[PDB]
Amino acid sequence: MTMEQFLTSLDMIRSGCAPKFKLKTEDLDRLRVGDFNFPPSQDLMCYTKCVSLMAGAVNKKGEFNAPKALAQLPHLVPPEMMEMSRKSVEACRDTHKQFKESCERVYQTAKCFSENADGQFMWP
């Protein structure tokens, strides 16, 4: 997809996931720009799970599958964000193993993506 289509997809993904949770605009907008530097609510952590389920990158137990994640990236991000996305997925392939609840597992994985992103990281 193109950069324009990707930026638009972020809003489409949030539009589908946000209604399921009680969330604050100011928390979602920090996630959007890669700022995972604040205390998440339980709702916000499960929100990241909802999003990652949509990508087919995690199971219901919040176990991240880097091979599958990598296989999904070709139709999820534009050419320009491929190397960054591959690098973050690879760096964070085992993050979920350090945590014990499915929502926490995915949230910490996404936080790790943002910490290992060499450029502008973005979350729906």
The Cβ-side half-sphere exposure at 109, using a 13 Å CA radius, reads 31
Which residues are within 8 A (CB) of 49 and not within 5 positions of it... i.e. 6 or more apart? 58, 62, 102, 103, 105, 106, 107
Q: What are the start-end ranges of the E strands in 2-61?
A: none
CA 19, 22, 23, 25 dihedral sign is positive
Element containing residue 2 per DSSP (H, E): none
Annotated resolution, angstroms: 2.0
- Rounded CA separation 34/119 (Å): 10
Nearest residue to 117 (alpha-carbon basis) of 68, 74, 75, 81: 81
1-124 classified as CATH 1.10.238.20: yes
Summarize the chain as % helix, strand, coil (round to 5): 65, 0, 30
Question: Rounded to the nearest 10 degrees, how much is the dihedral formed by the CA atoms of 26, 32, 15, 25?
Answer: 0
Sorted by where each begins, the domain ranges of the chain are: 1-124
